[PDB]
Structures are given as structure tokens and as C-alpha cells.
Amino acid sequence: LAVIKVVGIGGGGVNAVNRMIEQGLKGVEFIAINTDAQALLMSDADVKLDVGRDSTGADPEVGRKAAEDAKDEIEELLRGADMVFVTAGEGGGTGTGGAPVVASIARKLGALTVGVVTRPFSFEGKRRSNQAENGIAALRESCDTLIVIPNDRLLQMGDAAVSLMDAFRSADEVLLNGVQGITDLITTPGLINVDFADVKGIMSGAGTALMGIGSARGEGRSLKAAEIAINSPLLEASMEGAQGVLMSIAGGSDLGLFEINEAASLVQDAAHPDANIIFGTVIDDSLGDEVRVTVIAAGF
Amino acid sequence: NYLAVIKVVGIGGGGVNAVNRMIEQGLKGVEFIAINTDAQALLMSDADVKLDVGADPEVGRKAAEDAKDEIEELLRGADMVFVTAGEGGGTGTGGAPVVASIARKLGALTVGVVTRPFSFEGKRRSNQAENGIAALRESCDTLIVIPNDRLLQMGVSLMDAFRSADEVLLNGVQGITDLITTPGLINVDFADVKGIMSGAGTALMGIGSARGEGRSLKAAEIAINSPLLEASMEGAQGVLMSIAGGSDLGLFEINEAASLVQDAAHPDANIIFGTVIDDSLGDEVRVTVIAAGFD
Numbered sequence: 001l002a003v004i005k006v007v008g009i010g011g012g013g014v015n016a017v018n019r020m021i022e023q024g025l026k027g028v029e030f031i032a033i034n035t036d037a038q039a040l041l042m043s044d045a046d047v048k049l050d051v052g053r054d055s056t057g058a059d060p061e062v063g064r065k066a067a068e069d070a071k072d073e074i075e076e077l078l079r080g081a082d083m084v085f086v087t088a089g090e091g092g093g094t095g096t097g098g099a100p101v102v103a104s105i106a107r108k109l110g111a112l113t114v115g116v117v118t119r120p121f122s123f124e125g126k127r128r129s130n131q132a133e134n135g136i137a138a139l140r141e142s143c144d145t146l147i148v149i150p151n152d153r154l155l156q157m158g159d160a161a162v163s164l165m166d167a168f169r170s171a172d173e174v175l176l177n178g179v180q181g182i183t184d185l186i187t188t189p190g191l192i193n194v195d196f197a198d199v200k201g202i203m204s205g206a207g208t209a210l211m212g213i214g215s216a217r218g219e220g221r222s223l224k225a226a227e228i229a230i231n232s233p234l235l236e237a238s239m240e241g242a243q244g245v246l247m248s249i250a251g252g253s254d255l256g257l258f259e260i261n262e263a264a265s266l267v268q269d270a271a272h273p274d275a276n277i278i279f280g281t282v283i284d285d286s287l288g289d290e291v292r293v294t295v296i297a298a299g300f
Numbered sequence: 301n302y303l304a305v306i307k308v309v310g311i312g313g314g315g316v317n318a319v320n321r322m323i324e325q326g327l328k329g330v331e332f333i334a335i336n337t338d339a340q341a342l343l344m345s346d347a348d349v350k351l352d353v354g355a356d357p358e359v360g361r362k363a364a365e366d367a368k369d370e371i372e373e374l375l376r377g378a379d380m381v382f383v384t385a386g387e388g389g390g391t392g393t394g395g396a397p398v399v400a401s402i403a404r405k406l407g408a409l410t411v412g413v414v415t416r417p418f419s420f421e422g423k424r425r426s427n428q429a430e431n432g433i434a435a436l437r438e439s440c441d442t443l444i445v446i447p448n449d450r451l452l453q454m455g456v457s458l459m460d461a462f463r464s465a466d467e468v469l470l471n472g473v474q475g476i477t478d479l480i481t482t483p484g485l486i487n488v489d490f491a492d493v494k495g496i497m498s499g500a501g502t503a504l505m506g507i508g509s510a511r512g513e514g515r516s517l518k519a520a521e522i523a524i525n526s527p528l529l530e531a532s533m534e535g536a537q538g539v540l541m542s543i544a545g546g547s548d549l550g551l552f553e554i555n556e557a558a559s560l561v562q563d564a565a566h567p568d569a570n571i572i573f574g575t576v577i578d579d580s581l582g583d584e585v586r587v588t589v590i591a592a593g594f595d
């Protein structure tokens with residue numbers, strides 16, 4: 001029985017986590033870390049830590065110092081976790097600076113440490129994009145796996161008439177997608193069981209990674225969802241280059257092995273010839289006639 | 301004066317986190333108080349009462365001392381106060397002795413719970429772990445010391461080690477409070493608990509669990525021999541034992557467990573014995589033994 005903790009650090013990460021709770025992500029403890037006591041009052045995370053109270057504003061250095069000052073505190077909150085996720089929106093001060101610290105503390109404790117962060121949209125300014133660049137380099141060193149989701153690419157998906165708040169709600173969703181895609185294999189498996197040891201085996205020290213999501217209904221759903229996942233703009237066409245791929249397919253209890261397999265086979269065929277691919281399934285009884293496929297691609 | 305008022309104070313990062321666990325597990329019958337002692341960080345809490353008085357013990361000590369009146373008003377009217385800094389060090393280790401002294405001067409039965417870190421954790425300068433214990437020992441009626449090293453002889457990986465420490469910590473409070481607050485076939489008189497705990501000094505704890513036939517005896521045997529007890533059962537002058545179980549828990553089996561602790565305890569020992577009804581345990585029995593004093 002694995003203990004999984006998901007940490008949302010910074011305003012973006014704390015919003016992603018709330019979205020995760022609101023969408024019903026199960027079998028994980030949620031921890032919100034931020035430098036603003038108000039925003040935290042609003043979070044529905046299980047643990048809420050307010051850091052850098054004296055210091056405190058989009059300065060990654062302030063946020064690193066604020067997490068580092070609270071290092072013992074954070075470590076006490078994490079202690080006992082087999083798996084730790086660190087989600088944030090790269091670019092600001094709290095998530096950018098703080099994320100690597102929370103990651104390093106989890107990795108030091110020997111928890112499978114997975115980072116799940118977004119790159120800011122280009123329209124947000126070259127200062128943020130730069131700070132996210134440095135943020136992700138640091139975070140990379142602290143995580144077993146770091147999935148980086150480029151927000152610009154999210155605009156090539158969903159609606160073409162999306163406002164600025166919906167854009168960021170899509171960022172929340174996709175961060176949920178990345179966490180759920182993995183944790184659900186462990187907490188609520190289907191016919192094909194991929195357990196903590198398995199996920200640990202493929203994602204330990206796998207490095208930098210991208211994700212692809214796809215979903216569909218009705219005839220040929222599993223092939224359709226797999227195909228969308230593998231061609232996802234978030235994967236940045238780098239699928240056929242990946243050395244390690246974890247693939248999760250979720251559907252109701254009625255999800256048969258034939259469909260599972262079809263998706264699996266399509267994915268294999270698009271994958272690198274020497275690719276280590278693990279296929280797992282998820283029971284999710286809320287999905288109806290829909291299946292969703294998540295692909296995590298690493299080792300380029 | 302007739303429904304024990306029990307106040308559980310978690311102080312510092314590790315203390316509040318322990319209290320939040322207690323709320324999360326559904327610990328009944330007690331009032332929860334969260335005291336943040338750090339200036340730079342606040343761990344939030346769903347505790348009934350919260351006081352933010354904010355990695356040095358000295359810093360915790362002063363901030364607790366500065367807030368002594370507020371703390372005293374928070375503790376006024378309690379019959380029993382628990383105080384813990386939980387796992388990890390920090391300012392809470394400094395603040396704990398203060399809350400404890402305030403509670404004792406108010407005339408409450410003051411029980412501290414403290415943990416000794418795993419040796420693999422290393423040590424921070426000035427022996428501040430051992431000093432936090434000595435200061436808390438001077439301020440408490442009874443200090444329950446949990447030596448985490450002993451956990452690695454119970455039943456272990458690193459994540460289990462840490463999770464076990466948290467679980468036994470919660471039990472250092474729940475084991476005794478449940479006895480007091482939650483009915484069972486054999487109930488205890490608070491005045492007795494106060495009799496064996498008042499000015500008792502250091503105490504150690506032992507836990508045990510078993511299912512099926514001979515469960516009460518098996519769990520009590522595990523609890524009485526617990527490595528956490530550091531075999532202090534022999535010399536112990538004051539012993540509390542509690543058996544938590546479902547409603548069907550038989551008087552005979554209950555009595556066999558009580559008999560066994562009496563044989564194992566020192567001849568001159570005070571023994572307070574009782575059961576708890578917890579219908580969520582199923583076929584399981586959980587025993588807790590608190591051993592205080594020496595021969």
C-alpha cells in the first residue's frame with residue numbers, strides 16, 4: 001500500500017491541486033504550500049503551509065529562500081511518503097524557487113519524486129519564460145522524473161474562443177491529467193495492474209519527460225484515444241524518440257482486454273524500436289462510454 | 301468537574317502536524333489546540349483553538365513566554381493537558397516546556413509526549429534533543445518518551461519507519477484519552493489516572509494487536525513486552541493498561557489480559573485497567589500499556 005503525496009507550490013500549483021480535489025482525484029494526500037495566507041484559506045488541500053512570512057513577488061530567489069527556511073517543516077510533512085508529486089506553474093517566484101527544494105527533500109527521503117509543471121504562455125513575458133527555464137533546470141536535478149507541459153501547446157487544443165481564465169483552467173486540468181494518469185494506476189487499477197514497484201522501476205531517475213493525453217467515446221474509442229494521446233501537441237512530436245514510456249488507459253469496469261490491447265498495439269507501433277513501454281489500466285466508473293489514454297514519454 | 305476536560309496542545313511544526321493527524325483519525329473527547337511558534341512559516345490546522353505565537357528551541361521558548369497569558373487563558377479550566385512537539389525538532393521543542401509549566405501551575409494533570417529521533421537522523425548541535433526532554437520533564441507531571449529507534453525491532457523499511465513513528469505518537473495520546481473518555485465494559489476513575497500520573501516523571505509505552513482466539517492475551521503479551529517499553533515494565537511503579545475492542549469483548553478474556561499485566565508488573569505497582577469500545581476494529585483488539593516510575 002503506497003502512500004502518495006501531491007504538493008502544489010505557488011499560486012498556480014495550489015490552483016491545480018484544488019482542481020484535482022474538485023475533480024475527485026483519490027488515494028493521495030494533497031499539500032498546498034504558498035506565501036499568501038489568504039489564498040491558502042481557500043484551498044481544500046489536506047495540509048496547508050504558509051512560508052516566507054517575514055520576507056513577504058515573482059522573484060524565484062525569494063521563493064527558494066522561503067522554502068529553504070521551512071525545509072525541516074516541509075520534510076516533516078512529507079516523511080513516510082513512497083511517492084511525492086511536486087506541481088507548480090513555472091515563471092513566478094514561489095513555485096519556480098520553492099519547487100526544487102520540496103523535490104530535493106522528497107528525493108533525499110528516497111520517495112519516488114515526480115515533478116509536474118507547466119511552462120508559462122509566451123504572452124506572459126520573456127522574464128517569466130526565463131525564470132521558468134532556470135526553474136525547470138533546477139527542478140530537473142531534484143526529481144526522478146519531471147514532466148514539463150508547455151502552456152503554448154495547450155492553446156492548440158480545446159476551444160479556439162478561450163478566454164484568459166479558461167486558459168489557466170486548462171493548465172489546471174492538464175496538471176491533474178499528468179498526476180492522475182500515473183497515480184490512478186496504483187490506487188484504482190483495472191484488468192492490467194501496474195503497481196508502485198512497476199511505476200517506480202520505469203520513472204526512477206528517468207529524467208525529463210513529456211505527456212500526451214487523448215480521450216474518445218463509442219466505436220473504436222481506445223484506438224482513437226491512443227492516437228490523440230500519441231499525437232498530442234504536448235508530446236511535441238517526440239514520441240517516436242522516447243526510450244521509456246508509461247501508458248495508462250482508463251475506462252469503466254466494462255473495459256475489455258481487446259480494447260486495452262488495441263490501444264497498446266497502436267502505441268507500440270509508434271514507439272521507438274528499443275522502447276521500454278509499460279501499459280496499465282484504470283477503473284473509473286464515472287467515465288461512461290469514454291476512455292482516456294495518458295502517455296508519459298521520457299529518455300530522449 | 302465530571303466529564304474530564306482534556307486539552308491536547310500541539311506546538312511547533314511537528315506538534316500541529318500531530319494534532320492534525322489526530323483530527324484526521326477522529327480522535328474523540330478532547331479539545332485540540334494548535335500553537336505555531338515559527339515566524340517564517342505557519343502550518344494551518346483545523347484545531348478548535350489556534351494560536352500563532354511566532355529553527356531554534358530558544359526562539360520557541362521566548363515566543364511561548366511572550367504569549368504566556370494567552371496560553372494560560374486557553375488552558376484555564378482543563379483537568380488534563382497533553383503537550384507535544386511531535387516529530388522533528390525546531391521551535392516547538394522550546395515552546396513545549398512553557399505550555400506545560402503554564403498548565404501545571406493551573407493545577408491540570410500535565411502529560412508531555414516527546415520522541416527521541418532515529419539515530420540514523422543524525423544530531424543537531426548542543427544536544428538539543430536531550431535538553432528539550434529535560435526541560436519538558438521539569439514542567440510535566442508525566443513525560444511519555446517515545447524512542448523511535450525501538451520501532452525497528454517491532455513486528456521494516458524507511459517509509460515504514462517514519463509511518464510507525466507517527467502512529468505510535470498518536471497512540472501516546474489516544475491510548476490514554478480513549479480510556480478516559482470513551483466508554484467500555486471496564487471504565488476508569490479519572491482521579492486514579494491523576495493519582496498514578498501526578499508527579500510520576502518519565503513513562504514509556506508499549507502497544508499490541510491481535511485477532512481471533514486468545515486475542516486479548518496475545519495483544520497484552522505484545523504490549524507488555526514491547527521494545528518501546530525498554531523492558532521498564534518490571535520496575536514500573538504506576539501502570540495504565542487499556543484494551544480497545546468491539547462491543548462483544550468478553551469479561552473473561554478482558555480479565556485474562558488484566559491478570560497478565562498484574563503478574564508482569566512490579567508487586568508494589570499501581571495499576572489502572574480499563575477497556576474501550578471501538579466498533580470499527582472488527583475482530584481486532586488493541587492494547588496500550590503506560591509504565592511510569594522505578595524500583
Ligand SMILES: Nc1nc2c(ncn2[C@@H]2O[C@H](COP(=O)(O)OP(=O)(O)O)[C@@H](O)[C@H]2O)c(=O)[nH]1
Nearest residue numbers: 010011012015089091092093094095120171172
Ligand atoms: N495551472 C495554473 N497556472 C497558473 C495559474 N495562474 C498562473 N499560472 C501560471 O503559473 C505561473 C507562476 O505563477 P504563480 O504560480 O501564481 O506564481 P508563484 O505563486 O509566485 O509561484 C504563471 O506565470 C502562469 O503561467 C493558475 O490559476 N493555474
